[PDB]
Design an enzyme around this catalytic site. Structure first.
Site, short mmCIF file in Angstrom:
data_model
loop_
_atom_site.label_atom_id
_atom_site.label_comp_id
_atom_site.label_asym_id
_atom_site.label_seq_id
_atom_site.Cartn_x
_atom_site.Cartn_y
_atom_site.Cartn_z
N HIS A 26 65.74 25.70 18.04
CA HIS A 26 66.15 27.06 17.67
C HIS A 26 67.40 27.01 16.77
O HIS A 26 67.44 27.78 15.79
CB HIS A 26 66.41 27.90 18.92
CG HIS A 26 65.29 27.91 19.92
ND1 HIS A 26 65.21 27.37 21.16
CD2 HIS A 26 64.06 28.46 19.72
CE1 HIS A 26 64.00 27.59 21.71
NE2 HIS A 26 63.26 28.27 20.84
N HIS A 78 77.44 26.83 18.24
CA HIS A 78 76.26 26.77 17.39
C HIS A 78 76.36 27.82 16.28
O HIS A 78 77.29 28.65 16.32
CB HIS A 78 74.92 26.94 18.20
CG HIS A 78 74.92 28.31 18.86
ND1 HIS A 78 75.47 28.55 20.12
CD2 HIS A 78 74.45 29.49 18.40
CE1 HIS A 78 75.34 29.86 20.37
NE2 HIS A 78 74.71 30.47 19.34
N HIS A 95 73.93 30.61 13.49
CA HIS A 95 72.73 31.31 13.01
C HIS A 95 72.85 31.44 11.50
O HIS A 95 73.95 31.73 11.00
CB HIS A 95 72.54 32.69 13.67
CG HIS A 95 72.61 32.64 15.18
ND1 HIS A 95 73.66 32.55 16.04
CD2 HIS A 95 71.49 32.64 15.99
CE1 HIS A 95 73.20 32.52 17.34
NE2 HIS A 95 71.86 32.59 17.31
N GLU A 118 74.03 37.59 12.62
CA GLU A 118 73.45 38.42 13.70
C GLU A 118 74.16 39.78 13.73
O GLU A 118 73.55 40.85 13.51
CB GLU A 118 73.51 37.68 15.02
CG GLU A 118 72.68 36.42 15.01
CD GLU A 118 72.15 36.00 16.37
OE1 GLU A 118 72.98 35.82 17.30
OE2 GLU A 118 70.91 35.84 16.48
N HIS A 148 79.08 30.85 16.64
CA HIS A 148 79.29 31.31 18.04
C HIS A 148 79.94 30.19 18.87
O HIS A 148 79.32 29.13 19.09
CB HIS A 148 77.95 31.72 18.69
CG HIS A 148 77.38 32.99 18.09
ND1 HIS A 148 76.05 33.39 18.22
CD2 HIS A 148 78.02 33.95 17.36
CE1 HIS A 148 75.91 34.55 17.58
NE2 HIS A 148 77.09 34.93 17.04
N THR A 151 71.94 36.53 22.58
CA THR A 151 71.06 36.98 21.47
C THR A 151 69.76 36.21 21.42
O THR A 151 68.94 36.47 20.49
CB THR A 151 71.77 36.95 20.10
OG1 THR A 151 71.97 35.58 19.74
CG2 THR A 151 73.12 37.69 20.07
C1 LIG Z 1 72.04 28.02 27.40
N1 LIG Z 1 72.14 29.45 27.05
C2 LIG Z 1 71.56 30.46 27.89
C3 LIG Z 1 72.35 29.80 25.73
N2 LIG Z 1 72.58 28.85 24.70
N3 LIG Z 1 72.71 29.40 23.40
C4 LIG Z 1 72.51 30.78 23.40
C5 LIG Z 1 72.58 31.67 22.28
N4 LIG Z 1 71.88 30.99 21.19
S1 LIG Z 1 73.82 32.97 22.05
N5 LIG Z 1 73.60 33.37 20.63
O1 LIG Z 1 75.12 32.34 22.25
O2 LIG Z 1 73.43 34.00 22.92
S2 LIG Z 1 72.07 31.32 25.00
ZN LIG Z 2 74.39 32.45 19.03
#
Ligand SMILES: CN(C)c1nnc([C@H](N)S(N)(=O)=O)s1
Ligand SMILES: [Zn+2]
Length: 257
Positions: A61, A91, A93, A103, A116, A195
């Site tokens: 992702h 991470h 987007h 986002e 993020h 998200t």
């Molecule tokens: C492990 N968890 C639940 C998450 N890891 N990355 C996440 C998302 N991509 S965000 N955008 O931070 O909600 S949610």
């Molecule tokens: Zn994110």
């Protein structure tokens, strides 16, 4: 399962995750004229001097840079937050073109990408317990625009060649996340959600007003990553952003005048 394509993207997620149509979903559009300055906000404290990065992973992702969160090494405090939130991972987007990829939006403007930094509240003991709580997580969001290069991002760009496909990871020690921050800590804040599935409503969002600049060559390296696994036909990792969701019964607060 879930993804960002026509047959498994954001408009399908509600069939497995009905909270997708909930009362505090993210991201949202930030209407700058409507957001209001809040004097009750406390100053904001980013304390990343003892951060310990460990590894970088392609999850199918996005990619995550992971940190040692077994002690208070890199923490976020202050601002709207009560208590101490530990950095677990960051991470991004991003888009297929420079005019889309974020986002959150600002007066309906889309940026090229969004960073993020994800933190969990230490009163709940572990991340998995924290995501079951309305004040379990704090996510620091930072916009990226295309212009001059960001020297502090180059170490991330140069390792992406080693994690091209879903499930690959690499060592990523001694990385300093302080090099990803803009000069100003002015921000907007509101209560929202993850998200991506499972879309849990456990996040205090803190979105910085000042974007960082990255170069066209840096973003072009993000767009060479793959959603697919090794040995499978190529699906470029681009457009891995959820669009803005209904604000419903929420107010966005500003830290600045
Ligand atoms: C492990 N968890 C639940 C998450 N890891 N990355 C996440 C998302 N991509 S965000 N955008 O931070 O909600 S949610
Ligand atoms: Zn994110």
């Amino acid at each position: 399962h879930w993804g960002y394509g026509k047959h498994n993207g954001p408009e399908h997620w509600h069939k497995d995750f009905p909270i997708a149509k909930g009362e505090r979903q993210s991201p949202v559009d930030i209407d700058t004229h409507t957001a209001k300055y809040d004097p009750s906000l406390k100053p904001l404290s980013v304390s990343y001097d003892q951060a310990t990065s460990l590894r970088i992973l392609n999850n199918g992702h996005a990619f995550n840079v992971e940190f040692d969160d077994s002690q208070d090494k890199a923490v976020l405090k202050g601002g709207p937050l009560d208590g101490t939130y530990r950095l677990i991972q960051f991470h991004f987007h991003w888009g297929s073109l420079d005019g889309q990829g974020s986002e959150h939006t600002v007066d309906k403007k889309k940026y090229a990408a969004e960073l993020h930094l994800v933190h969990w509240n230490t009163k709940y003991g572990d991340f998995g317990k924290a995501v079951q709580q309305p004040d379990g997580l704090a996510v620091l969001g930072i916009f990226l625009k295309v212009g001059s290069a960001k020297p502090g991002l180059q170490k991330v760009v140069d390792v992406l060649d080693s994690i091209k496909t879903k499930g690959k990871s690499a060592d990523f020690t001694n990385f300093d996340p302080r090099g990803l921050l803009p000069e100003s800590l002015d921000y907007w804040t509101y209560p929202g959600s993850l998200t991506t599935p499972p879309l849990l409503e456990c996040v205090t969002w803190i979105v910085l007003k000042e974007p960082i600049s990255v170069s066209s060559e840096q973003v072009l390296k993000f767009r060479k990553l793959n959603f697919n696994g090794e040995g499978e036909p190529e699906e470029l990792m681009v457009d891995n952003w959820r669009p803005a969701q209904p604000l419903k019964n929420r107010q966005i607060k500003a830290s600045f005048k």
